[PDB]
Amino acid sequence: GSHSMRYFYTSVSRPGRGEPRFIAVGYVDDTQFVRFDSDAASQRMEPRAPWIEQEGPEYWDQETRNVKAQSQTDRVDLGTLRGYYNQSEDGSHTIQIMYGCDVGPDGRFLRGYRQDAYDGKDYIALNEDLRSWTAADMAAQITKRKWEAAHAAEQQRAYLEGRCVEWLRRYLENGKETLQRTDPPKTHMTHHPISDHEATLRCWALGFYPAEITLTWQRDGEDQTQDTELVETRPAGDGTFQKWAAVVVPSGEEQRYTCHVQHEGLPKPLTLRW
């Protein structure tokens, strides 16, 4: 199927508490394989998936060296952005970076992306063309001009279309038994009466991988989109996900309702009735 490799970076200044913190998380689809935390004792890029452990010391040395070099870029950027926005030296500010690349079933490049935020708002983004930048304000316009002059898009595109896809392809092959697997949802329904007039019908999807799932309630064929309570997909802790969808039904009409489960682990969508 379709696959992706994504890296998430968070840089937080904490004036007076400590040094700016840096967390780097690496993902292949919905599986984390690497981590770096400036607060942790190792000061190395650490393995978080079993299929990355087979990578030699030169991989680990390279990743540490490079993720350290990035944290240093982000530390000077925290200072640069405080200066752009005329913010106080005593406030806490946060830079967030996400980049990655997608491959199809053939293993060929699909899309590449690079997005940056400052204080939870868009800052600068690499455009779909991988050739230009979109600055969200006057300050991100200064950065845009720096990056245009430094040929940052050429550097980013060469990585996303080359090195990123070549690494993703290696990870998918080494991690085949887990990465190239789908776990279908283990569905069940539960009845929770509210009164003599109404009751709750909760549809559960547990143990599924990847996290993408659609739970839909229907009544005689019509979707109940406006009246379905949906929880956010949550991690089970073992690499799988959980989700539920609930709907309040009139006491003698439970049989008029069906829940539709859509997952790539399922060859045909499921339909649950009480």
């Binding site: 890296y7 640069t80 200064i142 720096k146 990056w147 550097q155 090195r163 990123c164």
Partner: peptide
């Protein structure tokens, strides 16, 4: 593997 040489803002 991560992007090699990140540019300052």
């Amino acid at each position: 593997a991560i992007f090699q040489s990140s540019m300052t803002k």
